[PDB]
Short mmCIF file of N, CA, C and O in Angstrom, two decimals:
data_model
loop_
_atom_site.label_atom_id
_atom_site.label_comp_id
_atom_site.label_asym_id
_atom_site.label_seq_id
_atom_site.Cartn_x
_atom_site.Cartn_y
_atom_site.Cartn_z
N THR A 1 223.06 -53.66 28.50
CA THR A 1 223.25 -52.24 28.15
C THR A 1 221.92 -51.52 28.09
O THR A 1 221.12 -51.91 27.22
N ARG A 2 221.66 -50.54 28.93
CA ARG A 2 220.46 -49.75 29.06
C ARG A 2 220.63 -48.26 28.80
O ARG A 2 221.62 -47.63 29.26
N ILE A 3 219.68 -47.73 28.03
CA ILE A 3 219.61 -46.30 27.65
C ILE A 3 218.41 -45.82 28.50
O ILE A 3 217.37 -46.50 28.61
N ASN A 4 218.61 -44.67 29.11
CA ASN A 4 217.67 -43.97 29.98
C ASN A 4 217.15 -42.77 29.21
O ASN A 4 217.87 -42.26 28.34
N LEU A 5 215.92 -42.43 29.60
CA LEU A 5 215.26 -41.29 28.93
C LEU A 5 215.15 -40.12 29.89
O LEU A 5 214.76 -39.04 29.41
N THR A 6 215.49 -40.36 31.14
CA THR A 6 215.41 -39.29 32.14
C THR A 6 216.53 -38.26 32.02
O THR A 6 217.57 -38.52 31.38
N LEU A 7 216.30 -37.10 32.61
CA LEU A 7 217.17 -35.93 32.67
C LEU A 7 218.48 -36.35 33.32
O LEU A 7 218.39 -36.72 34.51
N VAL A 8 219.57 -36.28 32.58
CA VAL A 8 220.87 -36.67 33.10
C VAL A 8 221.09 -36.00 34.48
O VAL A 8 221.74 -36.65 35.30
N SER A 9 220.59 -34.81 34.64
CA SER A 9 220.69 -33.99 35.86
C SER A 9 220.11 -34.68 37.09
O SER A 9 220.47 -34.41 38.24
N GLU A 10 219.17 -35.60 36.80
CA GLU A 10 218.48 -36.33 37.88
C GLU A 10 218.89 -37.77 38.10
O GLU A 10 218.21 -38.46 38.88
N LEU A 11 219.94 -38.25 37.48
CA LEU A 11 220.42 -39.60 37.60
C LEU A 11 221.25 -39.82 38.88
O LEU A 11 222.03 -38.92 39.12
N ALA A 12 221.04 -40.94 39.53
CA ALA A 12 221.86 -41.20 40.76
C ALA A 12 223.27 -41.29 40.20
O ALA A 12 223.41 -41.61 39.00
N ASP A 13 224.25 -41.01 41.03
CA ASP A 13 225.63 -41.07 40.55
C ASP A 13 225.93 -42.35 39.76
O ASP A 13 226.56 -42.25 38.68
N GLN A 14 225.47 -43.44 40.33
CA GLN A 14 225.67 -44.76 39.73
C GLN A 14 225.06 -44.97 38.35
O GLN A 14 225.77 -45.59 37.56
N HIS A 15 223.83 -44.49 38.14
CA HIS A 15 223.20 -44.70 36.83
C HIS A 15 223.79 -43.75 35.80
O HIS A 15 223.73 -43.99 34.58
N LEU A 16 224.34 -42.67 36.30
CA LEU A 16 224.94 -41.69 35.35
C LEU A 16 226.15 -42.37 34.70
O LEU A 16 226.33 -42.52 33.49
N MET A 17 227.03 -42.81 35.60
CA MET A 17 228.25 -43.50 35.27
C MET A 17 228.11 -44.67 34.31
O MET A 17 228.86 -44.91 33.34
N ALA A 18 227.09 -45.43 34.70
CA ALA A 18 226.72 -46.66 33.99
C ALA A 18 226.33 -46.31 32.57
O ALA A 18 226.87 -46.80 31.51
N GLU A 19 225.37 -45.43 32.53
CA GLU A 19 224.90 -45.03 31.18
C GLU A 19 226.07 -44.56 30.36
O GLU A 19 226.36 -45.12 29.32
N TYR A 20 226.70 -43.50 30.84
CA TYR A 20 227.83 -42.83 30.17
C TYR A 20 228.78 -43.82 29.53
O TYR A 20 229.17 -43.59 28.39
N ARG A 21 229.11 -44.85 30.29
CA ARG A 21 230.04 -45.88 29.80
C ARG A 21 229.46 -46.90 28.85
O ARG A 21 230.22 -47.45 28.03
N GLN A 22 228.19 -47.16 28.95
CA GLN A 22 227.51 -48.14 28.11
C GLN A 22 226.85 -47.65 26.84
O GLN A 22 226.65 -48.54 26.00
N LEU A 23 226.51 -46.42 26.67
CA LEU A 23 225.83 -45.85 25.49
C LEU A 23 226.65 -45.81 24.24
O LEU A 23 226.11 -46.09 23.12
N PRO A 24 227.93 -45.48 24.33
CA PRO A 24 228.78 -45.42 23.14
C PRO A 24 229.02 -46.78 22.52
O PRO A 24 229.61 -46.86 21.43
N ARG A 25 228.60 -47.81 23.17
CA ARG A 25 228.69 -49.22 22.82
C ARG A 25 227.73 -49.51 21.66
O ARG A 25 227.87 -50.43 20.86
N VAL A 26 226.71 -48.66 21.61
CA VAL A 26 225.67 -48.75 20.57
C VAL A 26 226.31 -48.43 19.23
O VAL A 26 226.14 -49.08 18.18
N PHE A 27 227.05 -47.35 19.29
CA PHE A 27 227.80 -46.76 18.17
C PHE A 27 228.75 -47.81 17.59
O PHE A 27 229.00 -47.80 16.41
N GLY A 28 229.22 -48.68 18.47
CA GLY A 28 230.14 -49.75 18.10
C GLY A 28 229.44 -50.86 17.34
O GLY A 28 229.98 -51.36 16.35
N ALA A 29 228.25 -51.20 17.83
CA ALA A 29 227.37 -52.23 17.29
C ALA A 29 226.89 -51.85 15.92
O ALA A 29 226.84 -52.71 15.03
N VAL A 30 226.53 -50.60 15.68
CA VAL A 30 226.07 -50.19 14.34
C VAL A 30 227.27 -50.18 13.39
O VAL A 30 227.09 -50.39 12.15
N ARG A 31 228.48 -49.95 13.93
CA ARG A 31 229.65 -49.95 13.04
C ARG A 31 229.94 -51.40 12.60
O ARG A 31 230.35 -51.57 11.41
N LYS A 32 229.78 -52.38 13.40
CA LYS A 32 229.98 -53.79 13.16
C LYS A 32 228.90 -54.36 12.22
O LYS A 32 229.16 -55.28 11.44
N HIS A 33 227.71 -53.80 12.34
CA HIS A 33 226.55 -54.20 11.54
C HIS A 33 226.77 -53.73 10.11
O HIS A 33 226.55 -54.46 9.16
N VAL A 34 227.22 -52.48 10.07
CA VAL A 34 227.52 -51.80 8.78
C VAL A 34 228.79 -52.44 8.20
O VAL A 34 229.00 -52.40 6.98
N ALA A 35 229.60 -53.06 9.04
CA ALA A 35 230.83 -53.71 8.50
C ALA A 35 230.38 -55.05 7.89
O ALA A 35 230.99 -55.60 6.97
N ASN A 36 229.29 -55.58 8.40
CA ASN A 36 228.69 -56.84 7.98
C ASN A 36 227.81 -56.69 6.74
O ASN A 36 227.53 -57.73 6.16
N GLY A 37 227.45 -55.48 6.43
CA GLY A 37 226.62 -55.08 5.31
C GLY A 37 225.17 -54.82 5.67
O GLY A 37 224.33 -54.69 4.75
N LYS A 38 224.83 -54.74 6.95
CA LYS A 38 223.44 -54.48 7.33
C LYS A 38 223.07 -53.01 7.13
O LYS A 38 223.88 -52.08 7.18
N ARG A 39 221.76 -52.87 6.88
CA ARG A 39 221.13 -51.54 6.64
C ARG A 39 220.08 -51.34 7.72
O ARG A 39 219.79 -52.38 8.39
N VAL A 40 219.57 -50.13 7.90
CA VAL A 40 218.54 -50.00 9.00
C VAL A 40 217.36 -50.89 8.63
O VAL A 40 216.75 -51.40 9.57
N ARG A 41 217.08 -51.04 7.34
CA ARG A 41 215.95 -51.88 6.93
C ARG A 41 216.09 -53.29 7.48
O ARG A 41 215.07 -53.99 7.57
N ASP A 42 217.26 -53.74 7.84
CA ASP A 42 217.46 -55.11 8.35
C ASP A 42 217.13 -55.36 9.79
O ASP A 42 217.11 -56.54 10.27
N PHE A 43 216.89 -54.32 10.55
CA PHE A 43 216.59 -54.43 12.00
C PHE A 43 215.13 -54.25 12.29
O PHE A 43 214.46 -53.49 11.59
N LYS A 44 214.70 -54.98 13.33
CA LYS A 44 213.27 -54.83 13.68
C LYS A 44 213.35 -53.70 14.74
O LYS A 44 213.75 -54.00 15.87
N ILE A 45 212.99 -52.51 14.28
CA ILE A 45 212.99 -51.36 15.16
C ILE A 45 211.54 -51.04 15.60
O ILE A 45 210.67 -50.65 14.84
N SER A 46 211.33 -51.23 16.89
CA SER A 46 210.07 -51.01 17.60
C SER A 46 209.65 -49.56 17.37
O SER A 46 210.54 -48.71 17.31
N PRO A 47 208.39 -49.32 17.24
CA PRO A 47 207.83 -47.99 17.00
C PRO A 47 207.71 -47.16 18.27
O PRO A 47 207.71 -45.92 18.28
N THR A 48 207.61 -47.86 19.40
CA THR A 48 207.48 -47.29 20.73
C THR A 48 208.63 -47.67 21.64
O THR A 48 209.12 -48.81 21.53
N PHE A 49 209.08 -46.76 22.49
CA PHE A 49 210.23 -47.07 23.41
C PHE A 49 209.81 -48.26 24.30
O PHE A 49 208.70 -48.35 24.76
N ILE A 50 210.78 -49.16 24.50
CA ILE A 50 210.67 -50.37 25.27
C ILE A 50 211.93 -50.57 26.11
O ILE A 50 212.99 -50.02 25.79
N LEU A 51 211.78 -51.38 27.14
CA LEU A 51 212.85 -51.69 28.08
C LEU A 51 213.60 -52.97 27.86
O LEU A 51 214.85 -52.80 27.80
N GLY A 52 213.05 -54.15 27.74
CA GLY A 52 213.85 -55.33 27.54
C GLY A 52 214.25 -55.67 26.12
O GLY A 52 215.06 -55.03 25.43
N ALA A 53 213.67 -56.74 25.67
CA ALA A 53 213.78 -57.40 24.39
C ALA A 53 214.57 -56.61 23.36
O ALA A 53 215.84 -56.83 23.33
N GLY A 54 213.92 -55.77 22.57
CA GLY A 54 214.73 -55.01 21.54
C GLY A 54 214.88 -53.55 21.95
O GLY A 54 214.69 -52.58 21.17
N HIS A 55 215.23 -53.42 23.23
CA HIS A 55 215.41 -52.03 23.80
C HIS A 55 216.53 -51.31 23.05
O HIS A 55 216.26 -50.16 22.64
N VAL A 56 217.66 -51.95 22.91
CA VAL A 56 218.80 -51.32 22.20
C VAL A 56 218.65 -51.25 20.69
O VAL A 56 219.28 -50.38 20.05
N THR A 57 217.86 -52.12 20.05
CA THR A 57 217.68 -52.07 18.56
C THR A 57 216.91 -50.79 18.23
O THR A 57 217.03 -50.12 17.18
N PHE A 58 216.09 -50.42 19.20
CA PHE A 58 215.24 -49.23 19.16
C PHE A 58 215.97 -47.97 18.73
O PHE A 58 215.42 -47.11 17.97
N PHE A 59 217.18 -47.74 19.15
CA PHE A 59 218.07 -46.60 18.89
C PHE A 59 219.02 -46.74 17.73
O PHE A 59 219.93 -45.89 17.46
N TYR A 60 218.86 -47.77 16.94
CA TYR A 60 219.69 -48.08 15.74
C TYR A 60 219.52 -47.00 14.69
O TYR A 60 220.50 -46.76 13.92
N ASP A 61 218.40 -46.32 14.64
CA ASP A 61 218.14 -45.23 13.65
C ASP A 61 218.03 -43.89 14.37
O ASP A 61 217.59 -42.85 13.84
N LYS A 62 218.45 -43.94 15.65
CA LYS A 62 218.46 -42.84 16.59
C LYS A 62 219.87 -42.50 17.03
O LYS A 62 219.93 -41.97 18.18
N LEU A 63 220.91 -42.75 16.19
CA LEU A 63 222.25 -42.37 16.76
C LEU A 63 222.40 -40.87 16.92
O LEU A 63 223.31 -40.54 17.75
N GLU A 64 221.67 -39.95 16.33
CA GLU A 64 221.92 -38.50 16.60
C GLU A 64 221.41 -38.16 17.98
O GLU A 64 221.97 -37.32 18.74
N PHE A 65 220.32 -38.81 18.39
CA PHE A 65 219.78 -38.54 19.74
C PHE A 65 220.86 -38.99 20.72
O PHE A 65 221.25 -38.27 21.67
N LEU A 66 221.33 -40.21 20.49
CA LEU A 66 222.36 -40.82 21.35
C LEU A 66 223.59 -39.93 21.50
O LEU A 66 224.08 -39.79 22.64
N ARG A 67 224.10 -39.39 20.41
CA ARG A 67 225.29 -38.53 20.38
C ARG A 67 225.15 -37.27 21.24
O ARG A 67 226.12 -36.93 21.95
N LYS A 68 224.03 -36.62 21.15
CA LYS A 68 223.68 -35.40 21.89
C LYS A 68 223.57 -35.76 23.37
O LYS A 68 224.01 -35.02 24.26
N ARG A 69 222.96 -36.93 23.63
CA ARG A 69 222.80 -37.42 25.01
C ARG A 69 224.14 -37.74 25.63
O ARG A 69 224.29 -37.64 26.89
N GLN A 70 225.12 -38.14 24.82
CA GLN A 70 226.46 -38.47 25.30
C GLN A 70 227.13 -37.21 25.88
O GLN A 70 227.81 -37.17 26.92
N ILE A 71 226.91 -36.14 25.13
CA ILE A 71 227.45 -34.82 25.50
C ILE A 71 227.03 -34.43 26.91
O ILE A 71 227.83 -33.98 27.74
N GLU A 72 225.75 -34.60 27.24
CA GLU A 72 225.23 -34.24 28.56
C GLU A 72 225.65 -35.16 29.70
O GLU A 72 225.69 -34.72 30.89
N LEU A 73 225.94 -36.38 29.41
CA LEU A 73 226.36 -37.42 30.34
C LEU A 73 227.80 -37.14 30.77
O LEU A 73 228.15 -37.30 31.96
N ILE A 74 228.56 -36.73 29.76
CA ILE A 74 229.98 -36.37 29.87
C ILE A 74 230.07 -35.10 30.69
O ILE A 74 230.86 -35.07 31.64
N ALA A 75 229.30 -34.07 30.38
CA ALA A 75 229.23 -32.80 31.06
C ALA A 75 228.62 -32.99 32.45
O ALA A 75 229.10 -32.42 33.47
N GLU A 76 227.55 -33.80 32.54
CA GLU A 76 226.99 -33.97 33.90
C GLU A 76 228.10 -34.63 34.73
O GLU A 76 228.34 -34.29 35.88
N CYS A 77 228.77 -35.57 34.11
CA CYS A 77 229.85 -36.34 34.71
C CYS A 77 230.94 -35.47 35.34
O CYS A 77 231.51 -35.83 36.40
N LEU A 78 231.18 -34.40 34.63
CA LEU A 78 232.12 -33.36 34.92
C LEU A 78 231.61 -32.53 36.13
O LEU A 78 232.30 -32.51 37.14
N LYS A 79 230.48 -31.90 35.98
CA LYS A 79 229.78 -31.05 36.92
C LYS A 79 229.69 -31.63 38.33
O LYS A 79 229.64 -30.84 39.31
N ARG A 80 229.68 -32.94 38.39
CA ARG A 80 229.59 -33.74 39.63
C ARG A 80 230.95 -33.90 40.27
O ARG A 80 231.12 -34.14 41.50
N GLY A 81 231.96 -33.75 39.45
CA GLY A 81 233.34 -33.87 39.95
C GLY A 81 233.81 -35.32 39.90
O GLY A 81 234.54 -35.79 40.79
N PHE A 82 233.36 -35.98 38.84
CA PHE A 82 233.72 -37.40 38.60
C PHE A 82 235.00 -37.29 37.73
O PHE A 82 235.16 -36.34 36.97
N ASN A 83 235.81 -38.29 37.95
CA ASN A 83 237.11 -38.47 37.29
C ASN A 83 236.99 -39.40 36.08
O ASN A 83 237.28 -40.60 36.23
N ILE A 84 236.57 -38.85 34.95
CA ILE A 84 236.39 -39.51 33.69
C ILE A 84 237.51 -39.17 32.70
O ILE A 84 238.05 -38.07 32.72
N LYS A 85 237.82 -40.11 31.86
CA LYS A 85 238.83 -40.06 30.79
C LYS A 85 238.03 -40.35 29.50
O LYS A 85 237.58 -41.47 29.27
N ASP A 86 237.89 -39.32 28.72
CA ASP A 86 237.16 -39.27 27.44
C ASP A 86 236.17 -38.10 27.72
O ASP A 86 235.08 -38.37 28.24
N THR A 87 236.60 -36.92 27.39
CA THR A 87 235.84 -35.68 27.59
C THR A 87 235.06 -35.12 26.44
O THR A 87 234.35 -34.10 26.64
N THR A 88 235.14 -35.66 25.25
CA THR A 88 234.46 -35.21 24.05
C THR A 88 233.67 -36.33 23.40
O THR A 88 234.10 -37.50 23.49
N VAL A 89 232.58 -35.96 22.76
CA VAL A 89 231.68 -36.91 22.05
C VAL A 89 232.45 -37.68 20.98
O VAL A 89 233.56 -37.35 20.53
N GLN A 90 231.84 -38.78 20.55
CA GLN A 90 232.43 -39.67 19.53
C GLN A 90 231.97 -39.19 18.15
O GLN A 90 230.81 -38.79 18.00
N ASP A 91 232.89 -39.24 17.19
CA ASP A 91 232.54 -38.79 15.82
C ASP A 91 231.84 -39.99 15.17
O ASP A 91 232.46 -41.08 15.15
N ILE A 92 230.62 -39.76 14.68
CA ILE A 92 229.94 -40.89 14.05
C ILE A 92 229.61 -40.62 12.59
O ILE A 92 228.82 -41.41 12.03
N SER A 93 230.20 -39.56 12.04
CA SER A 93 229.93 -39.20 10.61
C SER A 93 230.47 -40.29 9.69
O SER A 93 230.24 -40.17 8.47
N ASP A 94 231.13 -41.30 10.21
CA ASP A 94 231.64 -42.39 9.33
C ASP A 94 230.45 -43.35 9.00
O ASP A 94 230.45 -44.16 8.03
N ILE A 95 229.41 -43.25 9.81
CA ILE A 95 228.18 -43.99 9.76
C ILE A 95 227.15 -43.36 8.81
O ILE A 95 226.88 -42.14 8.80
N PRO A 96 226.54 -44.21 8.01
CA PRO A 96 225.52 -43.73 7.05
C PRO A 96 224.47 -42.97 7.84
O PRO A 96 224.05 -43.28 8.97
N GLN A 97 224.06 -41.93 7.15
CA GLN A 97 223.06 -40.95 7.59
C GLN A 97 221.81 -41.65 8.10
O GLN A 97 221.20 -41.18 9.09
N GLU A 98 221.41 -42.73 7.46
CA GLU A 98 220.20 -43.46 7.88
C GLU A 98 220.25 -43.96 9.32
O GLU A 98 219.13 -44.18 9.88
N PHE A 99 221.40 -44.15 9.93
CA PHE A 99 221.34 -44.65 11.34
C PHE A 99 221.32 -43.45 12.30
O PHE A 99 220.89 -43.68 13.47
N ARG A 100 221.76 -42.30 11.79
CA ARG A 100 221.80 -41.08 12.62
C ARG A 100 220.61 -40.15 12.57
O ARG A 100 220.59 -38.98 12.08
N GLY A 101 219.53 -40.64 13.14
CA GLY A 101 218.23 -40.00 13.30
C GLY A 101 218.19 -39.39 14.72
O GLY A 101 218.98 -39.65 15.64
N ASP A 102 217.21 -38.53 14.86
CA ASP A 102 216.96 -37.82 16.15
C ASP A 102 215.72 -38.49 16.78
O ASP A 102 215.10 -39.39 16.17
N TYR A 103 215.43 -38.04 18.00
CA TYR A 103 214.26 -38.65 18.68
C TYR A 103 213.78 -37.72 19.77
O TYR A 103 214.55 -36.93 20.31
N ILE A 104 212.48 -37.83 20.07
CA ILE A 104 211.89 -36.97 21.12
C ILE A 104 210.85 -37.80 21.86
O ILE A 104 209.77 -38.10 21.35
N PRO A 105 211.25 -38.16 23.09
CA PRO A 105 210.44 -38.98 23.97
C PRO A 105 209.23 -38.27 24.58
O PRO A 105 209.13 -37.17 25.12
N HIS A 106 208.18 -39.10 24.45
CA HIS A 106 206.86 -38.73 24.94
C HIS A 106 207.03 -38.83 26.46
O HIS A 106 207.75 -39.75 26.92
N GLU A 107 206.41 -37.94 27.15
CA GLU A 107 206.44 -37.87 28.60
C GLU A 107 206.14 -39.20 29.27
O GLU A 107 206.68 -39.56 30.32
N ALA A 108 205.25 -39.93 28.61
CA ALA A 108 204.81 -41.27 29.06
C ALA A 108 205.97 -42.24 28.83
O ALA A 108 206.20 -43.18 29.61
N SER A 109 206.74 -41.99 27.73
CA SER A 109 207.89 -42.87 27.43
C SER A 109 208.96 -42.68 28.50
O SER A 109 209.55 -43.72 28.92
N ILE A 110 209.18 -41.47 28.92
CA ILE A 110 210.16 -41.18 29.95
C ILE A 110 209.80 -41.82 31.29
O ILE A 110 210.68 -42.21 32.06
N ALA A 111 208.47 -41.86 31.55
CA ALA A 111 207.98 -42.43 32.83
C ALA A 111 208.40 -43.87 32.91
O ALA A 111 208.77 -44.43 33.96
N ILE A 112 208.35 -44.49 31.73
CA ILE A 112 208.75 -45.91 31.62
C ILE A 112 210.20 -46.02 32.07
O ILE A 112 210.47 -46.92 32.90
N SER A 113 211.05 -45.17 31.55
CA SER A 113 212.48 -45.21 31.93
C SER A 113 212.63 -44.86 33.40
O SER A 113 213.45 -45.45 34.12
N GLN A 114 211.84 -43.89 33.82
CA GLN A 114 211.88 -43.47 35.22
C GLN A 114 211.76 -44.67 36.16
O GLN A 114 212.71 -44.86 36.98
N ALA A 115 210.68 -45.38 36.06
CA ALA A 115 210.31 -46.56 36.85
C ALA A 115 211.36 -47.65 36.98
O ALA A 115 211.58 -48.21 38.10
N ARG A 116 212.01 -47.97 35.88
CA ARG A 116 213.06 -48.97 35.80
C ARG A 116 214.23 -48.50 36.67
O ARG A 116 214.81 -49.32 37.34
N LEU A 117 214.50 -47.21 36.60
CA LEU A 117 215.58 -46.63 37.38
C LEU A 117 215.11 -46.64 38.85
O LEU A 117 215.85 -47.09 39.71
N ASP A 118 213.91 -46.14 39.02
CA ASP A 118 213.24 -46.06 40.31
C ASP A 118 213.11 -47.42 40.97
O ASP A 118 213.33 -47.45 42.19
N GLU A 119 212.78 -48.52 40.32
CA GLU A 119 212.68 -49.79 41.10
C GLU A 119 214.01 -50.46 41.36
O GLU A 119 214.00 -51.27 42.33
N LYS A 120 215.06 -50.23 40.63
CA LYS A 120 216.37 -50.84 40.84
C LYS A 120 216.92 -50.26 42.16
O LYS A 120 217.54 -50.91 42.97
N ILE A 121 216.65 -48.98 42.32
CA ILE A 121 217.07 -48.23 43.50
C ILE A 121 216.53 -48.87 44.76
O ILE A 121 217.27 -49.41 45.60
N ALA A 122 215.21 -48.81 44.92
CA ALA A 122 214.49 -49.36 46.08
C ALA A 122 214.94 -50.80 46.31
O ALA A 122 214.74 -51.34 47.42
N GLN A 123 215.51 -51.39 45.29
CA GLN A 123 216.01 -52.77 45.36
C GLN A 123 216.95 -52.77 46.59
O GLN A 123 216.68 -53.51 47.56
N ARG A 124 217.98 -51.97 46.51
CA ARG A 124 218.97 -51.78 47.57
C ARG A 124 219.38 -50.27 47.54
O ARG A 124 220.37 -49.87 46.94
N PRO A 125 218.54 -49.53 48.23
CA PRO A 125 218.73 -48.09 48.34
C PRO A 125 220.11 -47.66 48.77
O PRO A 125 220.53 -46.68 48.07
N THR A 126 220.78 -48.22 49.73
CA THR A 126 222.11 -47.84 50.20
C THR A 126 223.30 -48.02 49.23
O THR A 126 224.47 -47.69 49.63
N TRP A 127 223.04 -48.52 48.07
CA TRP A 127 224.04 -48.75 47.03
C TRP A 127 223.94 -47.51 46.11
O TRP A 127 224.85 -47.36 45.28
N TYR A 128 222.91 -46.70 46.31
CA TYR A 128 222.75 -45.49 45.45
C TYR A 128 222.93 -44.18 46.17
O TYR A 128 222.45 -43.97 47.29
N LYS A 129 223.67 -43.30 45.49
CA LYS A 129 223.98 -41.94 45.99
C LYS A 129 223.76 -40.94 44.85
O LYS A 129 223.70 -41.34 43.68
N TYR A 130 223.65 -39.68 45.30
CA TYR A 130 223.43 -38.55 44.36
C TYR A 130 224.35 -37.42 44.78
O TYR A 130 224.13 -36.75 45.82
N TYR A 131 225.37 -37.26 43.98
CA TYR A 131 226.37 -36.20 44.31
C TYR A 131 227.09 -36.66 45.58
O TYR A 131 227.51 -35.87 46.47
N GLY A 132 227.24 -37.96 45.69
CA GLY A 132 227.87 -38.73 46.74
C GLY A 132 227.21 -38.71 48.10
O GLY A 132 227.90 -38.86 49.15
N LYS A 133 225.91 -38.53 48.08
CA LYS A 133 224.99 -38.47 49.25
C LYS A 133 223.94 -39.59 49.10
O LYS A 133 223.53 -39.88 47.99
N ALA A 134 223.53 -40.18 50.20
CA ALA A 134 222.57 -41.24 50.43
C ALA A 134 221.17 -40.68 50.70
O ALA A 134 220.69 -40.71 51.85
N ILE A 135 220.55 -40.19 49.65
CA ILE A 135 219.21 -39.59 49.64
C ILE A 135 218.09 -40.62 49.57
O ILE A 135 216.98 -40.41 50.12
N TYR A 136 218.46 -41.69 48.91
CA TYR A 136 217.56 -42.84 48.68
C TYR A 136 217.45 -43.64 49.96
O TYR A 136 218.40 -43.99 50.63
N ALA A 137 216.19 -43.89 50.25
CA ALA A 137 215.72 -44.62 51.43
C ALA A 137 215.05 -45.93 51.05
O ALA A 137 214.26 -45.84 50.08
#
């Protein structure tokens, strides 16, 4: 499960879809953690955005950022003319305030996300499209 920092507007059709479907999964994990009795103090939350290891733990105190980002994924999803079922954001007010923090990525942090998206593409360019077009070479 990967969270992207790039402009939803610039995601290849495939990464948009992927993200959109995988991000709300975070919300599920914090609900299970909180069902277990965990607090944000119990997670090792990295101070800087990262890609592998504890990439997803990173957003455990960032669910408000995640929620707002869901809105744009859903709307971008729409704008593209994708056939999605689930048109409104998830209510997370059942979750303690401490997990629902906001976040603002440093331009350098976004570049990190950019690259990961950017090298998966070049991996096999013909598997990626944008607005159902093969722009990637």
